């Protein structure tokens with residue numbers, strides 16, 4: 258009576274956390290080991306570590322359609338943590354080969370595609386090229402709908418390492434030392450979540466009937482913070498006040514067309530989040546929000562998150 | 568009265584294992600966090616995991632000489648786990664700046680440079696370009712000695728992941744499925760060691776008076792094996808005999824000059840170990856062999872190592 262789960266993208270940044278959260282949760286956890294990563298020592302040893310915790314290795318390749326069909330026939334639920342970084346080479350769209358395999362296999366009770374960010378259907382007017390991420394996720398969503406595959410879309414929170422640990426400064430992954438940039442006036446609400454919590458929520462929700470064919474939002478109330486509130490958390494932890502510089506929207510987007518395309522996409526996403534507030538510009542009900550659905554998850558607050566950087 | 572150890576290359580393949588072994592040994596463990604690393608999330612989070620285990624971050628950059636001086640002033644022993652992959656960019660020689668910093672600093676009881684492989688003064692006859700690695704490690708040894716810095720040189724074993732876990736097949740990091748290449752007659756003795764054992768021995772030797780100004784060998788007796796014996800260990804675990812093809816020396820090296828330079832070096836190193844038996848063609852005393860010196864370390868045998876691949 259354990260739910261059988263296949264994780265595809267098992268050595269990814271969020272993917273490896275989902276693997277471990279599925280194991281802790283008690284799911285019979287299967288991981289797709291692709292032959293193409295056989296010389297990447299950190300991926301190979303990750304898989305060895307998953308085995309020591311009870312994960313079952315499933316060999317398959319996205320170029321071998323029958324291998325993907327065999328893989329998904331072993332489980333009840335599939336979770337994809339496919340990368341989003343190389344949008345111009347359409348790695349989100351690689352998931353379409355998995356959707357086809359799931360359709361042909363017929364047995365999968367639920368599929369969680371690689372979402373875990375902003376809510377794609379709400380991003381219709383996003384800045385290009387950053388817009389491209391949402392199109393591709395939307396194209397995968399439509400592939401899911403057309404095949405009639407039951408689904409859950411996990412959305413709504415900034416990964417804490419990429420937007421809280423650095424006080425949203427972008428240029429590193431650590432808090433700044435003396436000066437900090439405030440984007441806009443810094444009073445736009447942002448949703449931050451420890452990625453291990455996002456992983457726990459994913460493992461709780463993937464066999465929850467309440468979230469069958471639903472969008473689940475990850476919006477822990479204590480972690481809805483403006484950028485200045487985030488900065489003040491850190492200033493209280495350190496005892497030192499940071500010299501602040503406000504950066505107006507127009508100066509943030511200045512000369513964006515001269516940046517490299519990936520940085521252009523990253524700047525666009527940041528703008529929607531921190532200037533327009535896309536993660537908080539709408540309300541969601543407790544019946545579709547993960548912290549209320551799963552109250553036993555004592556999610557990590559941003560003041561406990563930032564302590565590890567002291 | 569704890570030994571203060573600084574690790575340079577702390578997020579490296581063997582380096583991160585060294586950090587953890589030093590902590591488990593009880594040393595006061597410092598790790599050099601370089602600013603150039605600040606956007607590589609996996610390194611940033613390794614440093615955070617090290618802190619949680621009690622390591623002390625020490626910021627420094629190889630391009631800031633006095634940051635290196637300051638770092639090395641803090642400790643009694645320095646361990647370098649500098650990379651050896653980019654020998655055409657001389658990254659092994661980057662250690663020379665660290666040696667200058669230790670010389671200026673004057674306080675360092677013992678320096679362990681980035682050795683952990685073939686015994687470099689024994690490789691004067693190695694094939695190019697593969698020999699460049701040992702040349703550069705020799706130049707580092709010179710600077711250490713020319714500056715009077717006390718040292719321990721840790722040498723003599725193949726990293727198990729790169730040469731045991733794949734049955735020495737090179738093309739993958741996992742055992743082969745049905746066929747295996749036997750190099751020569753497969754009767755040449757090779758030394759294999761789990762890299763966590765290599766790190767444990769490193770941590771136990773860095774303040775051992777017996778190994779001050781000595782080369783210490785990692786040659787655990789049950790792990791001195793021919794490639795054929797290694798293969799037969801795997802066949803006994805799986806109950807499947809592999810189909811064997813022997814590759815003669817001349818054919819192994821054929822057309823080496825048409826391969827990419829890093830692969831050329833990889834082949835040359837492999838030849839000395841597996842064809843020429845460079846790791847086992849000489850005798851070493853128990854007083855200069857780590858498994859004798861540190862008999863409390865119950866080193867992993869290659870049958871236990873390979874079990875994790877089943």
Ligand SMILES: NC(=O)C1=CN([C@@H]2O[C@H](COP(=O)(O)OP(=O)(O)OC[C@H]3O[C@@H](n4cnc5c(N)ncnc54)[C@H](OP(=O)(O)O)[C@@H]3O)[C@@H](O)[C@H]2O)C=CC1
Pocket residue numbers: 265266267268269270271272289290291294300319338339340341342348351371372373374375414415416417419
């Ligand atoms: N703040 C937020 O909310 C953020 C959200 N995200 C989103 O999370 C999801 C995953 O992103 P992330 O964890 O950073 O991804 P990663 O960059 O860590 O890649 C994850 C996995 O993608 C697989 N992968 C990459 N390329 C291919 C390919 N050509 N073919 C097959 N598999 C491939 C690999 O699986 P394998 O393990 O098999 O090798 C890889 O491990 C995305 O949808 C992303 O947009 C990401 C960062 C921030």
Ligand SMILES: NC(=O)C1=CN([C@@H]2O[C@H](COP(=O)(O)OP(=O)(O)OC[C@H]3O[C@@H](n4cnc5c(N)ncnc54)[C@H](OP(=O)(O)O)[C@@H]3O)[C@@H](O)[C@H]2O)C=CC1
Pocket residue numbers: 575576577578579580581582599600601604610629648649650651652658661681682683684685724725726727729
């Ligand atoms: N079978 C055997 O016996 C083998 C032995 N070895 C040897 O082990 C030793 C370490 O190798 P390995 O663990 O694979 O190395 P890695 O490839 O893991 O690199 C280790 C560290 O080197 C640092 N580094 C790399 N380039 C630079 C640079 N330009 N400037 C400053 N620092 C740099 C980085 O330290 P940081 O953490 O600060 O970023 C990196 O993490 C070498 O001597 C190698 O020859 C290697 C593999 C097989």
